[PDB]
Amino acid sequence: GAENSVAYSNNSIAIPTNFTISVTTEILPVSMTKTSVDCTMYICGDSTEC
Amino acid sequence: CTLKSFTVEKGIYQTSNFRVQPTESIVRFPNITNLCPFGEVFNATRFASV
Ligand SMILES: *[C@@H]1O[C@H](CO)[C@@H](O[C@@H]2O[C@H](CO)[C@@H](O)[C@H](O)[C@H]2NC(C)=O)[C@H](O)[C@H]1NC(C)=O
Numbered sequence: 001g002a003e004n005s006v007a008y009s010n011n012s013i014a015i016p017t018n019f020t021i022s023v024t025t026e027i028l029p030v031s032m033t034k035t036s037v038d039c040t041m042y043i044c045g046d047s048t049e050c
Numbered sequence: 051c052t053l054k055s056f057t058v059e060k061g062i063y064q065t066s067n068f069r070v071q072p073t074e075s076i077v078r079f080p081n082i083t084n085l086c087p088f089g090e091v092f093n094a095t096r097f098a099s100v
């Protein structure tokens with residue numbers, strides 16, 4: 001990152017005089033696709049023997 | 051039967067897969083009718099050596 005040092009002192013305060021109102025997005029998943037598989041047809045396939 | 055109990059409580063359960071049964075099974079082959087060279091292979095005596 002941009003390496004910099006702060007002008008620290010034991011009698012100095014830095015106070016803002018302006019503000020920026022910013023808007024920030026943030027994206028979160030909440031759900032997966034509701035899948036479902038079937039034993040008797042996947043493993044076997046329309047087959048009585050299997 | 052699948053839940054394995056005699057009293058099922060409220061809710062949507064899954065029983066099985068369903069599929070439409072096969073009706074009027076069909077078999078298909080080519081049209082040629084020529085018995086393959088069977089006699090030319092067995093009914094002979096001058097079989098070669100191994
Ligand atoms: C504090 O910051 C705001 C940032 O918008 C300054 O507002 C701008 O001021 C300049 C000149 O004063 C204008 O040309 C811009 O159009 C202003 N921005 C907007 C969005 O209107 C404001 O001036 C700053 N405070 C002081 C005291 O200067």
Ligand SMILES: *[C@@H]1O[C@H](CO)[C@@H](O)[C@H](O)[C@H]1NC(C)=O
Pocket residue numbers: 088089090092093
């Ligand atoms: C071979 O010859 C025998 C003789 O008895 C006959 O029975 C048989 O049908 C013949 N088969 C073929 C493939 O020619």
